Write a protein that binds this ligand. Structure first.
Ligand SMILES: *[C@@H]1O[C@H](CO[C@@H]2O[C@@H](C)[C@@H](O)[C@@H](O)[C@@H]2O)[C@@H](O[C@@H]2O[C@H](CO)[C@@H](O)[C@H](O)[C@H]2NC(C)=O)[C@H](O)[C@H]1NC(C)=O
Lengths: 100, 293, 196
């Protein structure tokens, strides 16, 4: 019920993917995105991993939305939305890249 | 991309500190993740609703967090991710230790004299596996040890056998156990007090060394035995005890002795391992004329 | 202190696809007791240790038992013995290479996609299996192979194909766990005959 849901996106290589993750009952925990390498991207509206393509699109208590510009084949895979309630509930998004 | 890994140990239930050396600090985001890659602290902010983790020092030199109430489910790589370009990891691998629990000594079957004793000793939780040594009256006994790993922890056992007479009863046997979670040359110990059964022995001691007519004598039967014997029977050969004799428990009370109350009296006691009998030759002295010495 | 030499890894019973394999890893001497870890290529496998102090030293030993299918054949397994008599992060590792058996399979490759009369055709019967099947048996129904056909091992050469060498040829091979057969249909086209 307070579990985040995200939908897989799919992008032509070189494009910008928009990853979106939202929560109905946030139980006063922050969301976060990690990349397929368990490496933190955005925790709330605070940027973590210093990459320039990766940019923030929304940070309201109920949604975390980021955009990875100029996508490349090495940006495919499972991005983990985490909400830091107890227990920590996760939601995965599978980026697929078109072109080569 | 660089990865450096220190090592870090706890005694179970204990408290561990994780220092994240940072060489020179610009100010960039610092994340810490449990081994499930779940972020404890994104920079200062707590981000796992588990309050055993507290944040101590965040100083241009290092970051330090503390896990209180360590469990075996808290081992693994603790990631310290410093987010600059490029990123730099510090992985502190936590190893949690169970110091051996108090040894438990049991005897297989009852120690009987002449027979043998089978003593065992079991640490049920050790990490690393323990070492069981046996000591008896400050010498070491040689055992037959062998463990088994029920998860991350070890139950070890060690079973010594030796021979016992009645001296050995009441005697102390020490099982001590030690491993790494305990200072070098320390140990937990457990002392088992032997219990050897033995066939009884009786012996009579008298109230007076010289018994004269019209005295009251009390004989006493000085039994030993394991089990101790619970009944004593008093006898005067094929003859009745003096009337007025009081055979009560472990004492015969002869009062108003008269020269016909002479004879050899016996006390007789037994347990499950044997019998015993002792024998007092009663002699009532008089002012009459005696054969010469 | 005593350091653990290289783990001795044995297998009790020959493994077999569909079934299970049980590995035993032995360190006859270590003081302290060596910590035995199983690793399957990258990941970590869970075993069950059980030692016995013979004096000052121990003979620790662990055992893991998982399922195997043909794909795991010749696969790679690692037993990793720690200790205190060993430097930090180091270990005495040892590799085992599975030996899973399975039912053979057969599949026929030709040397040539269209046959016209007079040609010569080599049929390769590409067989897998463990143990390798020792006999590739070529056959053509209840009938007989062409006169000059020579089955040399796992090929079947058919020289100078006349139009009466047609119909289905099968190679056959098997080992103790199973049997496979593959089937090829020879059409010997006359020259000047559209084939598509
Ligand atoms: C992220 O790292 C620290 C965050 O810690 C803050 O300071 C702690 C001491 C404590 O107060 C926490 O609750 C805070 O969130 C930031 O620290 C600044 O830099 C140092 C601390 O090492 C000290 O110079 C400053 O006073 C701190 N001031 C501010 C305004 O943060 C650091 O700047 C953060 N970096 C980013 C990129 O967010």
């Amino acid at each position: 019920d307070s579990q985040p849901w995200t939908s897989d996106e799919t992008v032509v290589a070189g494009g910008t993917v928009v990853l979106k993750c939202q929560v109905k009952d946030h139980e006063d925990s922050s969301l976060q995105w990690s990349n397929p390498a368990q490496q933190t991207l955005y925790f709330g509206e605070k940027r973590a991993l210093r990459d320039n393509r990766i940019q923030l699109v929304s940070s309201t208590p109920h949604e975390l939305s980021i955009s990875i510009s100029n996508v490349a084949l090495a940006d495919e895979g499972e991005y983990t939305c985490s909400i830091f309630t107890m227990p920590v509930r996760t939601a995965k998004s599978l980026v697929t890249v078109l072109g080569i | 991309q660089e990865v450096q890994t220190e090592q870090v140990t706890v005694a179970e239930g204990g408290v561990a500190e994780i220092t994240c050396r940072l060489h020179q600090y610009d100010g960039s985001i610092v994340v810490i993740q449990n081994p499930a890659r779940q972020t404890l602290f994104f920079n200062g902010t707590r981000a796992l609703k588990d309050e055993r983790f507290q944040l101590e020092e965040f100083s241009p030199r290092r970051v330090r967090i503390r896990l209180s109430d360590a469990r075996l489910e808290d081992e693994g790589g603790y990631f310290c991710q410093l987010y600059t370009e490029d990123t730099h990891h510090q992985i502190a691998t936590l190893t949690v230790l169970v110091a051996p629990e108090n040894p438990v000594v049991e005897v297989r079957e009852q120690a009987v004299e002449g027979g043998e004793v089978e003593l065992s000793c079991l640490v049920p939780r050790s990490r690393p596996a323990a070492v069981l040594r046996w000591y008896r009256d400050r010498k070491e006994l040689k055992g037959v040890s062998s463990g088994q790993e029920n998860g991350k922890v070890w139950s070890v056992a060690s079973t010594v056998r030796f021979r016992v007479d009645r001296k050995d009863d009441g005697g102390i046997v020490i099982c001590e156990a030690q491993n790494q979670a305990l200072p070098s040359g320390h140990s937990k110990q457990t002392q088992y007090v032997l219990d050897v059964q033995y066939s009884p022995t009786a012996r009579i001691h008298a109230s007076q060394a010289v018994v004269r007519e019209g005295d009251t004598l009390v004989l006493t039967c000085a039994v030993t035995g394991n089990p101790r014997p619970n009944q004593i029977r008093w006898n005067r050969g094929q003859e009745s005890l003096p009337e007025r004799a009081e055979a009560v428990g472990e004492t015969l009370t002869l009062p108003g002795l008269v020269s016909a109350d002479q004879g050899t009296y016996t006390c007789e006691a037994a347990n499950k391992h044997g019998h015993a009998r002792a024998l007092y030759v009663l002699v009532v002295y008089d002012p009459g004329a005696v054969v010469e010495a």
